[PDB]
Structure formats: C-alpha cells, structure tokens
Amino acid sequence: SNPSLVIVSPALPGANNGNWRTAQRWKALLSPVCSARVVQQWPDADASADTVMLALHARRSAESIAHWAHAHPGRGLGVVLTGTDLYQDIGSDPQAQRSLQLAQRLVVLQALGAEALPPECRAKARVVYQSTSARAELPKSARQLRAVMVGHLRQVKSPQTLFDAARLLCGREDIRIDHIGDAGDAGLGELARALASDCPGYRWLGALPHAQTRQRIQRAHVLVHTSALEGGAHVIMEAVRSGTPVLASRVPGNVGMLGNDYAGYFPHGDAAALAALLEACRAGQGAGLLDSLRTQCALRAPLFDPRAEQAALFQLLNELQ
Ligand SMILES: CC(=O)N[C@H]1[C@@H](OP(=O)(O)OP(=O)(O)OC[C@H]2O[C@@H](n3ccc(=O)[nH]c3=O)[C@H](O)[C@@H]2O)O[C@H](CO)[C@H](O)[C@@H]1O
C-alpha cells in the first residue's frame, strides 16, 4: 500500500502566499505515488492513517512536529525550512531547535540552505528547489523601464529599500515601479501610500490574485526583490520562468535561487545600489544589463521545472517510508 502523506502548512486554507502554494503544489506532485492531504495542525480526526509528515516552518509548525515525533519516534518526519526558522529562529528559539533534532530529514529550498544549519543537522538535510510553470518570454518596449516587486508587506521583505530607491528615482518619468502585496505589518502600507502620492512612477497595487500577479511579472522588464532573508522565494522563480530578469538583495536565500555568479545583486538595504542597477537597466534599453541578466536567468530556469521538484520529492518520500 502507498504511503499516506500529511503536509502541515501554517497558512490559512486558500491563502495566496508561499506556504500555501508550496503545500498545494507538493500535494499535486506527490499524488501519483501517495494519498496526500494538507492541514494546519496535526493530529486531527484522520491522523491514525497518516504514515509520513512533511511540516513547513520549524517554529510555526513546532507543536505538530513534536506531536508526530512522540507518536512515531524515529520515523516518517520531514521538517521544511521555509525562511525565518532557518535564517532567524533556529539561532536561539527552543521550538525550532527541537524540530531540527526530531526530524528524520530536513528540507531546504535552495543549494545554500544547509550552510545555515548546525553541522550535526547537515547529514539529514535535503535540497528541494521549488518549481513553477513557465510563461512565454514577451518582447518588451525600450520606451520606459517597468519594474515590479511582489510580496505581502512585512519587515522581512525589507520594502523600505524599494520605497527609498523609488524616492531616489522620484523625478525619472522613464522608470516605473509597481509593488504588489497586502498591507500586513503595522504602517508599511501607509509608507507605500504616501510614496505613491508623491512619486507617480511608484504604484502600490495592494494584494492581487496570483493569475494577475504572474501576468504582471511576465509583462515587467525586471523583478526587484529586496528581502532580508528568504527560504527560496516563489516570486524569483516566477520571474525567471517568465524570462523576466531579477534585481535581488545579496542574502543567501536569493543567492541560492539566482546563482553565485549572478550580475544582478545589490547589498541588503542599499537603496542607492538598487537605484543604480535600475538606472543601468534603463540606460541599456534601445550589451545592456537587462540582456546580460536575461542570459544568466535563462541558465537558472531549468532548476524550477516541476518534474525536477517531483523527482526530488519522490526520493525524499522513499527515504521517509
Ligand atoms: C522566507 C520568506 O520570507 N518567505 C518564504 C515563504 O514565502 P512568502 O509568502 O514570503 O514568499 P514567496 O515569494 O515565496 O510566495 C508568495 C506567493 O504569493 C504570490 N503573491 C503574493 C502577493 C500578492 O499580492 N499576490 C500573489 O500572487 C506570489 O506570486 C507567490 O506565488 O515561504 C516560501 C515557502 O513556502 C519560501 O520559502 C519563501 O522564501
């Protein structure tokens, strides 16, 4: 009999965010070799039939991770390091530390992940790059540069770097910056509203449905991503797999997605460096930076093929049962 997989995701059901997206995608990819279901917490009325658990976020799902560990000591637990666990919490957070100890396998979502784990956790760490469907690379206009950044506004997304680069470029009518994401963390949507009132090339569109978000990523000349940390951001692969090049903060989660040799990084929180890269992208339109970055992004794009992710998850499942 095939395994009965439970995926634990701290996301609300139907949420438009990474943690829901990963859990739903993994359920789809694994369905040909197992019975798969997604929950927010474990156990539940259906818990007795589950044989394997993949739990997202070593802190946020720590109570379900421990429930599983105590019910199945030494068997069937994979803990998936989705971001603030790996790059924040495992530091000093006893829940995140326990989850790391209890897991039979740890999953990181790009090549650099295990560098952030304790050395005693590296032998059971597995890399599972995420995947996304491709979109046709669109030909685009040289008349203007249109940038997009995508992320629900929270401090970890360092939206202030974008706000500050948009402000440096306030008078540049030839450069447009669209920003997609809900107004989560206290007062970030107010900063975005004030900036869009002052600097008409900058627009904060609020949260948009995923279909519309993918279409805007495809249509933009460039995707800007400023975060302090990422587990392995969906929006970077969504751009890459649309033929939209990226400007990203030099933090491990981003470097793991775009490569050690990528020419499109700026130092974390350096608004001037980001504004300089946008000016260089614009200058090149008409040898140009956008073309250089498109070439580099096209070599990354096969990392994000769902067949690749499926094969990595099939291997992981066979290890856990
Ligand atoms: C560490 C961190 O800070 N973020 C992590 C978190 O995802 P996040 O939710 O922080 O970021 P993400 O970019 O991985 O995923 C956001 C998803 O929502 C979509 N979107 C977003 C806003 C909006 O208005 N419309 C829209 O469609 C976007 O297109 C993407 O598919 O979990 C993921 C795994 O599950 C990854 O590990 C991320 O790196």
How many CA atoms lie less than 13 Å away from 203 in the CB half-sphere?
13
| Count of positions (residues) in the chain | 321
**Centroid of chain to Cα 148:** 15
- Statement to judge: residues 191 and 237 lie in one domain: yes
Q: How far apart are CA 242 and CA 161, in angstroms?
A: 24
The phi, psi pair for 190, rounded to 5°, reads: -60, -45
Which residue puts its alpha carbon closest to atom 7 of ligand 1? 18
Q: Resolution in A for the shown PDB structure?
A: 1.6
Cis peptide, bond prior to residue 43, ω within 30 of zero: yes
Residue 168 · residue 275 · CB < 8 Å: yes
Among 86, 235, 238, 244, the mutation site with the greatest number of ligand 1 atoms within 8 A of its Cβ is: 235
Which tokens go with 143?
A: 């008349």
* Together in a domain, 16 and 108: yes
Measured CA to CA, the distance from residue 149 to residue 159 in angstroms comes to 9
Q: Distance, CA 263 to ligand 1 centroid (Å)?
A: 23
- Are 212 and 241 in a shared domain? yes
The answer to whether residues 187 and 70 belong to one domain is no
Q: Does 204 lie in the same domain as 95?
A: no
Does the residue 140 lie in any domain? no
The residue whose CA is least distant from atom 26 of ligand 1 is 210
Is residue 247 within 8 Å of residue 284, measured between CB atoms?
no
- Assign residue 35 the CATH number of its domain: 3.40.50.2000
The answer to whether 229 and 84 are in contact (CB under 8 A) is: yes
**Residue owning the nearest CA to atom 10 of ligand 1:** 18
Q: Please state, in angstroms and rounded to a whole number, the distance separating the CA atoms of residues 263 and 312.
A: 28
Q: Show the ligand 1 pocket: residues with CB < 6 angstroms.
A: 16-19, 21-22, 82-83, 109, 150, 152, 156, 180-181, 207-208, 210, 213, 227, 229-235, 238, 253
Residue ID of nearest Cα to ligand 1 atom 38: 233
How far does residue 84's CA lie from ligand 1's centre (Å)?
A: 13
Q: 230 CA distance to ligand 1 centroid (A)?
A: 9
| 272/166 Cα distance (integer angstroms) | 10
* 295: in domain: yes
Same domain, 153 and 79: no
C-alpha–C-alpha distance, residues 86 and 115, integer Å: 10
Nearest CA to ligand 1 atom 31: 234
Cα 209 from Cα 122, distance rounded (Å): 37
- Residue 231 alpha carbon to ligand 1 centre in Å: 10
Please enumerate in sequence order all residues whose Cβ is within 8 A of that of 251, keeping only pairs 6 or more positions apart, or say none.
87, 227, 228, 229, 230, 268
| Residue 249 located in a structural domain | yes
Supply φ then ψ for residue 210, to 5 degrees: -55, -40
| 84 Cα nearest atom in ligand 1 | 1
Exposed/middle/buried for residue 59 (C-beta within 10 Å: 0-12, 13-18, 19+): buried
Q: How far apart are the CA of 151 and the centre of ligand 1, in A? A: 6
Cα–Cα distance measured from residue 7 to residue 42, given in angstroms and rounded to the nearest whole number = 9
CA distance 165 to 246: 15
Q: Give me ligand 1 centre to Cα 49, in Å.
A: 31
Q: Which atom of ligand 1 is nearest to the CA of 210?
A: 27
Which two structure tokens, joined as six digits, stand for 31? Answer: 């369905």
CA angle 92, 232, 167 (to 5 degrees): 95
In ligand 1, which atom is closest to the CA atom of 212?
Answer: 27
Atom of ligand 1 nearest to the CA of 19: 35
Task: Give the method of determination.
Answer: X-ray
- CA separation for the pair 275, 88 (Å, rounded): 28
- What is the token pair recorded at 113? 């992940």
Residue 88 burial (10 A CB sphere; 0-12, 13-18, 19+): middle
Q: Helix 188-198 and helix 159-168: axis angle, to 10°?
A: 10
Cβ-based neighbours of 284, under 8 Å, separated by 6 or more: 290, 291
* Alpha-carbon span 240 to 204, nearest angstrom: 22
What gap in Å lies between CA 201 and CA 56, rounded to an integer? 37
Reduce the secondary structure of the chain to three states and give it as a string: CCCEEEEECCCCCCCCCHHHHHHHHHHHHHCCCCEEEEECCCCCCCHHHCCEEEEECCCCCHHHHHHHHHHCCCCCEEEECCCCCCCCHHHCCHHHHHHHHHCCEEEECCCCHHHHCCHHHCCCEEECCCCCCCCCCCCCCCCCEEEEEECCCCHHHCHHHHHHHHHHCCCCCCEEEEEECCCCCCCHHHHHHHHHHHCCCEEEEECCCHHHHHHHHHHCCEEEECCCCCCCCHHHHHHHCCCCCEEEECCHHHHHHHCCCCCCEECCCCHHHHHHHHHHHHHHCCCCHHHHHHHHHHHHHHHHCHHHHHHHHHHHHHHHC
Which of 155, 213, 234, 237 maximizes ligand 1 atoms within 8 Å of its Cβ, making it the mutation to test the pocket? 234
Q: Is 231 exposed, middle or buried (0-12, 13-18, 19+ CB in 10 A)?
A: buried
Residues 149 and 297 grouped into a single domain: yes
Measured between alpha carbons, how far is 234 from 67 in angstroms, rounded to an integer? Answer: 29
- Residues spanned by the domain of 80: 4-131+305-320
d(CA 178, CA 282): 16
Q: How far apart are CA 208 and CA 16, in angstroms?
A: 9
**How many domains is the chain built from?**
2
> How far, in whole angstroms, is CA 260 from its chain's centroid?
18
Q: Which atom of ligand 1 is nearest to the CA of 180?
A: 24
Question: Do residue 108 and residue 227 come from a single domain?
Answer: no
Residue 138 belongs to some domain of the structure: no
Identify whether 139 is part of a domain.
no
Nearest atom of ligand 1 to the alpha carbon of 83: 1
Q: Which atom of ligand 1 is nearest to the CA of 130?
A: 34
